[PDB]
């Protein structure tokens, strides 16, 4: 059934599973036409497919050319997502295929179910969690590779960097969700927090800065402060 607080430790067991987030697949800027009407202009997008145990993010870039001459793009975006996830699974060796795919939005269920009919033993599940994966495009190196793409492209990233050398998946996922939640609630402040100290760098092969354990604790604290702060600034408390 649905993934929620009660069964949250299942994410880190040894059954392979993927989160699929489609929020950033179909992205548009809305603007005025010469005639004063309103029109959209699509920009490049991505499917966010994450194995939460390993940190493996299969980032499928969606190039704006895929929308050309198509109608009802918001609906197509979900079936396109499902087609690309199904293609990914088929490309993986059997022993690497997920036993469960968890979708962050319920409208992905039927599209993904239909595209995976060939895989009756893979469970397609929703979640009650309000996960912050939409904020993946606030991570500068992911944003940059999406916007530079001139064709469809799959980029392969470990979204935990080297954190699993020092911490468990549960802790790594909790850090990641806290970082993304912060970026989603106040991207400017979040990014100021992550970079304030010029001496802490991001390795060329990483996404996030190279914090010591102690520095990660300070960072994590600052991000929680931010999320409560904005929660007050937003709610006046």
């Amino acid at each position: 059934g649905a993934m929620n607080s009660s069964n949250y430790a299942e994410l880190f067991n040894n059954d392979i599973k993927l989160f699929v987030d489609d929020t950033n697949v179909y992205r548009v800027t809305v603007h005025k036409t010469f005639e004063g009407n309103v029109a959209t202009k699509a920009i490049n997008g991505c499917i966010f497919t994450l194995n939460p145990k390993t940190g493996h993010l299969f980032l499928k870039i969606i190039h704006t050319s895929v929308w050309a001459g198509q109608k009802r793009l918001s609906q197509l975006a979900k079936w396109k997502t499902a087609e690309e996830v199904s293609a990914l699974v088929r490309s993986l060796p059997k022993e690497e295929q997920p036993k469960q795919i968890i979708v962050t939005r319920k409208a992905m269920l039927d599209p993904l179910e239909v595209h995976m009919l060939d895989f009756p033993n893979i469970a397609i599940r929703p979640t009650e969690l309000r996960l912050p994966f939409s904020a993946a495009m606030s991570i500068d190196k992911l944003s940059d590779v999406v916007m530079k793409a001139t064709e469809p492209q799959m980029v392969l990233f470990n979204i935990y960097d080297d954190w699993l050398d020092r911490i468990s998946s549960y802790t790594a996922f909790s850090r990641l969700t806290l970082l993304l939640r912060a970026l989603k609630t106040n991207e400017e402040s979040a990014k100021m927090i992550l970079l304030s100290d010029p001496t802490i760098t991001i390795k060329s092969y990483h996404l996030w800065p190279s914090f010591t354990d102690e520095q990660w604790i300070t960072i994590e604290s600052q991000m929680r402060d931010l999320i409560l702060t904005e929660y007050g600034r937003k709610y006046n408390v």
Partner: protein, 300 residues
């Protein structure tokens, strides 16, 4: 006009014949039903006064034999049987008619209801849904489950309706996933009509039979099948114009005939609202939408 005689009525029972019903009292002198219109299937059905659990009954066609009803005190129900001795049967009926021990099938001359509910239903197809080949008639009751139901337990006692499942490889061409899920015309016209049913008459016959078993026996797997077959047409962008016009007629008479106090259970809110207001054929069911809105506006 034909006759279904009754050996006796030893337990108090409500007897149905098609859309008619009457109460018979324990050991009342009742010996059957006469003047049954030839040319249609029929269903004679039962609900015991003592245990309203289990409505059961028998589909039959008087052109296919002489059938009578006899109570079985061991199995505790009214059983249909075929009399092979023709002169025996005529003499029995004649004696019961002379003694006026039979109720008359009470059809109004203006009234085409039963024709309109059974237009496409044929005994030969019923017998393929209800497999019991040593009898010319078919038993159905409230509790019988369908083949599809058993897939999700006794096979010999199942209703073998054609399985429809919108999220199945049968319904969805590889590479046409979105197209075929959002517009079911492929599944309707190629898979079901051309492949399985051969023609729309057979499709409509199963749909009418499913409705009738839902209405008369409260058979839940049948109601599921009736709604599935409606939804498959309504959710196809491309439907022969003649099928749509006839579907509207079929449904119109089904909604007209449904008991008002059973609409809460027999009618699926999601299917009807989708079919009448959101689907491709939302504008193609004028008679059915008008009667639904004037008789069950609550459901919508």
């Amino acid at each position: 006009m034909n006759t279904v005689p009754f050996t006796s009525a030893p337990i108090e029972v409500t007897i149905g014949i098609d859309q008619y019903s009457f109460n018979v009292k324990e050991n009342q002198p009742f010996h059957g039903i006469k003047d049954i219109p030839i040319g249609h299937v029929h269903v004679i059905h039962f609900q015991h006064a003592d245990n309203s659990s289990m409505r059961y009954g028998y589909w039959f066609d008087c052109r296919m034999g002489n059938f009578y009803i006899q109570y079985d005190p061991k199995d505790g129900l009214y059983k249909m049987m075929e009399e092979r001795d023709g002169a025996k049967f005529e003499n029995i009926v004649h004696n019961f008619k002379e003694r006026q021990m039979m109720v008359s099938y009470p059809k109004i001359d203006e009234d085409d209801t039963w024709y309109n509910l059974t237009e496409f239903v044929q005994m030969d197809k019923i017998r393929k849904i209800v497999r019991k080949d040593e009898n010319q008639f078919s038993y159905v009751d409230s509790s019988m489950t369908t083949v599809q139901e058993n897939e999700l337990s006794d096979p010999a006692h199942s209703l073998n309706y054609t399985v429809i499942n919108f999220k199945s490889r049968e319904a969805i061409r590889p590479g046409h996933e979105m197209e075929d899920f959002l517009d079911k015309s492929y599944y309707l016209n190629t898979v079901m009509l051309q492949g399985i049913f051969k023609n729309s008459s057979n499709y409509f016959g199963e749909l009418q039979f499913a409705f009738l078993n839902a209405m008369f026996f409260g058979n839940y797997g049948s109601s599921l099948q009736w709604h599935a077959m409606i939804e498959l047409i309504c959710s196809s962008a491309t439907v022969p114009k003649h099928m749509l016009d006839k579907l509207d007629e079929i449904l119109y008479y089904q909604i007209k005939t449904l008991p008002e106090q059973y609409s809460d259970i027999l009618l699926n809110e999601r299917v009807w609202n989708i079919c009448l207001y959101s689907s491709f054929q939302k504008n193609s069911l004028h008679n059915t939408e008008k009667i639904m809105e004037n008789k069950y506006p609550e459901l919508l």
